[PDB]
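batch job 7 of whatever, protein = Argonaute
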Amino acid sequence: MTLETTLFPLEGTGACGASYQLYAVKGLSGLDETEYHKNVNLLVRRLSFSMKAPFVALSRDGEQFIAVPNYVTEFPVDHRVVRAMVKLVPTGEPLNLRFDAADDEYDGLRLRYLDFVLQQPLFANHHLWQPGSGQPFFHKKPLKRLDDVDLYDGVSVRAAKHPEGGFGIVCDARSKFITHTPIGARADRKRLGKLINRSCLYKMGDHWYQFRIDAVSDWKVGEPSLFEGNVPISLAQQLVRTAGNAAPKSIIDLDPEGGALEYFTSTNERRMAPAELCFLIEDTHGRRAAKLQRQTILSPSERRARVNGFIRRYLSELNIGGAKLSAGARAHAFFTETHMPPALSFGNGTVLAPDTSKDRFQAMQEYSSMRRTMMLDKKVGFFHQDVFPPQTLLLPESVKKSWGPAFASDFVGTVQELYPAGGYRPEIIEYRDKAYGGGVPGQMKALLEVAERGEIKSGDVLVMLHRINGAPRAQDKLAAMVCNEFEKRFGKRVQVIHSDSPGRGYKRIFKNDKPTYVQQRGRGVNIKGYLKGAALNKVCLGNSRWPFVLRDPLNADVTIGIDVKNNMAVFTMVAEGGRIVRVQRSRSRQREQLLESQVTQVITEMLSKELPEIKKQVQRVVIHRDGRAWPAEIAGARKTFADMAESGLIAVDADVSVFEVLKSSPAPLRLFSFEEPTQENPKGVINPVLGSWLKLSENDGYICTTGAPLLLQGTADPLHVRKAFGPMAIEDALKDVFDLSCLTWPKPDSCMRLPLTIKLCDIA
């Protein structure tokens, strides 16, 4: 109930002049509404980096109007490229913004200005450094030495609005791994070349920054490579030219036979750095250095200590010209009523409700465990208990010839236990995984030939694939290809498993004078768990047999998720308590955005098939967009439901609200709770509990979809959701984000950060 944030009050915020003067953009009156807004921000970013000033966007009405600080002296006004050139007619009215006012429409300006000028002092700090503009500030001194690699601690800072009036700062702790020794001068041509597109920390004297390597310089540090006016000049000469006063020996005593890396700027120009002063950034998602990565995951006590310490060490005194600023000693804290998890409907009339006569922690633990136990109990079981339509299990021939048959027997028995009503009994069918393949071509030839011969009777296929790309931070092209061609060309609905994971669960043994495959409970996988999980997710959920649903209505009658990534749009729909769930794909022009007409067609077509099944008259609707939302999409959104209300399919006085779910959030905010200080927890800092929530303004809030009882380690990351339109309160919207995230179907006894609505987008 008693909760703290990482949102620190800003003090001394009088006498702060954010001086702009608007301009307007004639451009091309061909408002493509899809190309019209790409070029809006294209030029804003292009001008921000060249002029090195806080250019922002305030798109009103015509959705033009780049805002320019009045203190930039020269200005081109008319700007090139971008197809049809633009003129910048100044709308005049110089704007000298304050920070003591009420909530205004120019605030998206002030925030930008604030952010920009907060990184002037921290830039000057000899003990801190920043990988690049916008990234967090790390100490020059490593937090820890992990052998050949150093762990660096930093803090990220964004400006934000204080819910109790005024302005403040949100910050979070942050980690980074950098190899301890530099690449060095002795590394040869071939070795430097083998490092392209890697990123390194460059210690250019007292100025440290991060850049991505593009090419190996033809020239060495000592050989002339560039020009100081018109004289051939070495990289060593250049670095000596621009060093300050008490320059460190390293920048003025370079080995001249060392090589140089080449990189590009924000301004898109080519520079060199001496490899003798470059330190590779290690990717801990790569190397599966998960023993390294635990070091990156902080206890709440640790996270609060590190953030508060950074605030009191580097943000107490801060001058930007004539202004003098502070940051509150203690962060914004409050009381609140944590949301209780929703009551859930299982099979045979059974309902799960949290115990209000328990402390929230214990009640949540018992509810979450009860989701699994109730699903498994043959006396209550799945909400949706019916037999399965025909099924197919499609295996690599190499698997079918060895350990496949034992895995299949176990998998069928596991499904029949988990989901007794299904009568699971698939046809087992193989493909020639060794005949053409190895990679995606040839695996696909084998899969396609099996499907073409019509061997896959039935429409539901579970297909076992080899893992082509074993490295993490990689996409499964083969699985996507198999889903696309089996949906598109044949009628099929395809779920996927891989062969490495169950393969590690079988070993060959001699029994009864026969070679035989049997389970091994050793190392590589826990096969019983594997079986129950894949049974749940690929066969049960893959056939839309939901294990439980919400008992009570949400604030929305219908709630729709949208995600556009890879030119490949995904709509999802949840209605009734989760008893109605649809997912439809598409393709659109832009790789991360959607056309307006497409939106209004797909949503109408999708919801109309389900309105006969939606018994209660529909009168409030919510859209969850994954990431940034586009107004081209809001237009079609409002249109769809206005039309439907006119028809009468929907309530006449019905409304729509649109909310963005920012899973990686521009302003990262944490929440802490407090327990009695134990010997282990010296300040008694603990995770917030599962329903905790906070709104900042009418447009921004945070729900803990992950939190206290159910988190193994780390400090929970609150989920940011931001209003974009509509009458529904942000509080109501957060509450049914929380309820939708308790539909933890992929793993009943766990917590789950995204609401089911955008989770269904993520899996496709």
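notes: The longest strand covers residues 149-161.
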